[PDB]
Design a protein around this ligand. Structure first.
Ligand code: FEX
Length: 216
C-alpha cells in the first residue's frame, strides 16, 4: 500500500513483512545456546520465504544461510535492543553477558553496534529489507552462481532505497547510512569466530544445529 512502490514492489514487501512479522524471544552455556538456537531457527524460517530463494542452486542456498548467520543475528539483536527492550533491561543484559565468560573485545563492539544502528532509527520495514539484503549477498564464500543471487538482491536494494525516502524524506543520505552500517555488521564475522574459540577448546557441547550453522 505505499503508493511510491510499483505493484511488483508492493507484493515483494508484503511477503517479506508477512514472514518477518513472525519473529520471537521471551547453565550459562545453555542460556547462550538457547538464545543462538532461537536466532538460527528464525533465520532459517525467514530465509526460506525470501522472494526467489526457492529458485537457487541447493548448495548455494546453504552457503547463503551459513554465510549470513552471524550478521543476521547481530542485526536482529540490534532491532530488539532498540525497538523492543526497555533500556533498563539492556544494562541488565550487558552486566549479565560480561560475567558469562565472554570477553570484552566481543561485548564492547556488540553494544557499540547496537547504539550505532540505533542512531539510524530504522522502521521495522527497513530492518526486514536490510536483513533480506544481508542474506541474499552474492559475495558469500562458496557461492557458485553469484549472478543469480545478485538478481534476487538488486530488487530488494531498490525497495529499500524507496523505503528510506518514504520513512525519512528529510534525510537524503539515509539509504547510504544504512549501507554504511553493513560494513560495521560484517566485523562480527571475526568477533564471533574469535569469541567461539575459547568455548570450543574447553569443550562444551555445541548442539547439532549450531555445529552445522557455525561450523564447529
Ligand atoms: C548468559 O547469556 C547472556 O548474558 C546473554 C546476553 C546478552 C547481552 C546482549 C545481547 C544479547 N543477544 C545477543 C547474543 C550474542 C551472542 C550469543 C551467543 C554467544 C555464544 C554462544 N555459544 C558459545 C553456544 C551462543 C550464543 C547469544 C546472544 C541477543 O540475542 C538477545 C538476547 C535476549 C533478547 C535481547 C537480545 C545477549
Amino acid at each position: 500500500s505505499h503508493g511510491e512502490l510499483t505493484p511488483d514492489q508492493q507484493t515483494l514487501l508484503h511477503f517479506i513483512m508477512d514472514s518477518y512479522n513472525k519473529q520471537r524471544m521471551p547453565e550459562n552455556f545453555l542460556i547462550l545456546t538457547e538464545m543462538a538456537t532461537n536466532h538460527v531457527q528464525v533465520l532459517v524460517e525467514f530465509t526460506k520465504k525470501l522472494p526467489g530463494f526457492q529458485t537457487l542452486d541447493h548448495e548455494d542456498q546453504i552457503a547463503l544461510l551459513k554465510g549470513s548467520a552471524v550478521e543476521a543475528m547481530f542485526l536482529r539483536s540490534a532491532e530488539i535492543f532498540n525497538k523492543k527492550l526497555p533500556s533498563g533491561h539492556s544494562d541488565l543484559l550487558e552486566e549479565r553477558i560480561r560475567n558469562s565468560g565472554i570477553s570484552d573485545e566481543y561485548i564492547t563492539p556488540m553494544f557499540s553496534f547496537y547504539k550505532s544502528i540505533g542512531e539510524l532509527k530504522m522502521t521495522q520495514e527497513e530492518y526486514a529489507l536490510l536483513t533480506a539484503i544481508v542474506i541474499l549477498s552474492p559475495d558469500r564464500q562458496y557461492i557458485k552462481d553469484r549472478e543469480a543471487v545478485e538478481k534476487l538482491q538488486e530488487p530488494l536494494l531498490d525497495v529499500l532505497q524507496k523505503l528510506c525516502k518514504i520513512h525519512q524524506p528529510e534525510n537524503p543520505q539515509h539509504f547510504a547510512c544504512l549501507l554504511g552500517r553493513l560494513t560495521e555488521l560484517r566485523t562480527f564475522n571475526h568477533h564471533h569466530a574469535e569469541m567461539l574459540m575459547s568455548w570450543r577448546v574447553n569443550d562444551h557441547k555445541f548442539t547439532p544445529l549450531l555445529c552445522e550453522i557455525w561450523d564447529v
